[PDB]
Amino acid sequence: NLEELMRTGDYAQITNMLLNNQPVALVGALPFITDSSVISLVAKLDATV
Amino acid sequence: YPSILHPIDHAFNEYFLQHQLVEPLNNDIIFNYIPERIRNDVNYILNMD
């Protein structure tokens, strides 16, 4: 839960999951970038954010 | 290193060398240096950056 993460400020769990490549779902109202480039998808830019 | 010393001077210098007050320092020592009740308080987020 992103709201709970922002409220508590404890980033241990999310940092551990991101460093260990553990599949997760970050839940919460987020803005997103709409990218229509196929080369961007092949370059796997979505995984770099 | 080689040194030339009177036995009393050697005694003093050897005592200084053998009984230094410095000790290894790591993130664990710093983390334990923080008071425990502050490390368990969820209002404070402590990180080792």
Added chain:
Amino acid sequence: QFDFRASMHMLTSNLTFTVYSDLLAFVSADTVEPINAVAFDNMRIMNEL
């Protein structure tokens, strides 16, 4: 009398190290927003909101 054999010693120490004084300077310390600060019972310190 000066005796070379009784005066020659090998003094031993470390090659190099760095000594630190402020251990808490190595700690990145942050706090939650005071609105969300909680007491020992995990309830908010002030609830009349």
